[PDB]
Amino acid sequence: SRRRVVITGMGMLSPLGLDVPSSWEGILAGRSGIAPIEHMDLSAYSTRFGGSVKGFNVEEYLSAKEARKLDLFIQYGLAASFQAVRDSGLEVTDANRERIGVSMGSGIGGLTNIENNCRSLFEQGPRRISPFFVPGSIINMVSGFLSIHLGLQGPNYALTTAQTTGTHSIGMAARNIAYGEADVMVAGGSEMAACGLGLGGFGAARALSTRNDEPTRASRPWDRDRDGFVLSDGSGALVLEELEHARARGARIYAELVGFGMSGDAFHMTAPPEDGAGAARCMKNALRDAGLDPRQVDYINAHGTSTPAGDIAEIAAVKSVFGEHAHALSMSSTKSMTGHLLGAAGAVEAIFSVLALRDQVAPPTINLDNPDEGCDLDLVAHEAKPRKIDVALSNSFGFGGTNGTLVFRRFA
Amino acid sequence: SRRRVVITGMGMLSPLGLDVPSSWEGILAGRSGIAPIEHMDLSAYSTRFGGSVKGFNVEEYLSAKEARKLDLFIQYGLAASFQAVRDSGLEVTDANRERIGVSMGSGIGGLTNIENNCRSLFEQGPRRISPFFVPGSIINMVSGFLSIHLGLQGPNYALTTAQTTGTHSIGMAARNIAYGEADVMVAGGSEMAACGLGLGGFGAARALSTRNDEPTRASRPWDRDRDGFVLSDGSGALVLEELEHARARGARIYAELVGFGMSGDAFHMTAPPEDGAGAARCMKNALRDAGLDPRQVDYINAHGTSTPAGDIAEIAAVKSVFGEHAHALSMSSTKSMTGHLLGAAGAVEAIFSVLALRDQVAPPTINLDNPDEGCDLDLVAHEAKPRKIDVALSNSFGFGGTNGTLVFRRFA
């Protein structure tokens, strides 16, 4: 048997806002968080825009001294984590601190720090590398710093599964609770890859939209004029909690996490199979995990990256899993507004999936002016769609063919 | 109910050898793999030696076409994974490919590739970044590329928990199998952090031994003259398999994985607590998970990094967990010979713990000339100790205060 897992707190930094309610308001209004990247000479780059976090104030969370030791992706992860723990109302005590752990991940981790220390190393040699370079840049330091700050002694780890990180982090944290290794977990991911090496790295692979003239129209999942994903920064964190533990302290429960699927495509390093066979196995695994018939799904938060191949693979995957129900659910890509937060994508999209359940509304796929060949599902083009949502799926597909699916349900 | 997990295949690159048996021969003979680094000019650096893999031929495993795209840490991880799979005798089929996954992790990932692409960006501009920079550097692409080459469609992920990565990767993969999420997992880790950024970064923290004039004597866990860890490269991979699945196919079983513990110190970003309280919590979690009396433990493969604070914290933890039995078990640090493979340390040390069970011998702690104050356990100083070993424990403790413990026992 297995314990039940609920969501009792959420926290976020995104291109749409510095917390969950500001981000969610932007999502339901179809606002874009995408703009030209400031304070950076991107003249020589084929992409000059992305989803930046605007006006982040790290001194709301950390002292100047502790902030200087930490890459922006760690700052962002800690901001989301502190928000989520505050939102949960949980009180850490000597009686429960061994039962509270952390799994906050990242796809690409501390590129900004690596860039700045490369500069020191190439220009002045190794003796000008910062002493906090390593501990301030390693992906497991959101989990590490959070556990030190709050006194959490539970399972402490970090996933790095590229664009799937945030989905896997949440799913595995939910397993830890379900199988009794923890009663509470803070889970999610963070990313700040808008450095030269990030825009340059994805640019070299020609994976990014180059729609420099109209950045807000660049991210257009399933639209015939899409030309690659939009690179975005931020973080998402959820407080996952065993149901009886949540009920005993009178926690506000947002939703239940009922299903988690994983699969490998075993197909290509960066491209999904055209038929989305891997994504289809992963969704089927997640529904089996939840004991749910495909017909019970109302809402899918797609991976929906705005790549030619990825977007069409997900349509094929959903038609395959859902058959005669594939048109009755609503599926949307909030990446149309946020861009692609890479390892934080799954974290912020799990939060959007929980809020779709709370507010009974499917967020829009903006910029979906001209659906592509066979993109004839209900993709919630342009504007939010109030509807019945009992069950919401959130999908992530990443480099290496690594897939994850979360299944959330309304809690009563 | 929870299924039993056994080890049916192992694979390794280390400073001592290009496979498991050559590395193990070195371990039992007390040989050092530590030597001045040849692959770059380190005259500006305070540490100029480490544990290199010597004479690695990637063309034993991969086409030159594919090898050229991958960071050394990925090449090392694939080599160890291929060795492990071949050693297992397992055949991948349409009937079992959905039930075989991979969890190969890294602490730092493709730092050589990142540094080289940073150099291109700064000297020549973004148009000179490799198109393969991201998929060839990102930590999850051991798991990704292995799944693509062998057709593994089961759970596909990667951990990054700094110096605990290999132990956590093996533990969590064992839980996948235990809980029914897979029947087989390839799990471990790989590392190649020996570039200017890595030696410079750890140097800037003053975490490394600076014994440049006697590199084979540098790694001296629990010795009064120790002065930090020795940086080393390589990979370990194990094929973990559900017991009845192994029995059904007539697999050779090396040993059974009976216990896994995790804990967070919640103390400091880099330093362990002097009393080893988190390490003690982690070992107790693992022994209770294994259903053991602590007196059943015969051998501990320590973390034993050759840091002043780390080594003595481990003695304090072991004395706290095992009481008077702490004087009866044998505990050694193979890092005395291999140095510290960071995210691959737990993976190679899990293999050495399994071979300790197969061959009924405690590997030595070489260089243990003058044991420090209170380091008065059986630390297997200088020479391998043949002895009865039914139960072997492998510990790892990392930045962020993140702890892991694996418990292995003989299988009859």
Ligand SMILES: CCOC(=O)[C@@H](F)[C@H](O)c1ccc(Br)cn1
């Ligand atoms: C291209 C992907 O790169 C990364 O993920 C890096 F962030 C990597 O994990 C790393 C390098 C150096 C140090 Br210090 C810590 N972590």
Ligand SMILES: CCOC(=O)[C@@H](F)[C@H](O)c1ccc(Br)cn1
């Ligand atoms: C302080 C944590 O205490 C516990 O009892 C367990 F959580 C245990 O450490 C553990 C955690 C996660 C996984 Br996977 C496996 N084992």
Ligand SMILES: CCOC(=O)[C@@H](F)[C@H](O)c1ccc(Br)cn1
């Ligand atoms: C008996 C052989 O060893 C000695 O005589 C001493 F040198 C002692 O072993 C020592 C101390 C510090 C370091 Br570094 C290395 N060796």
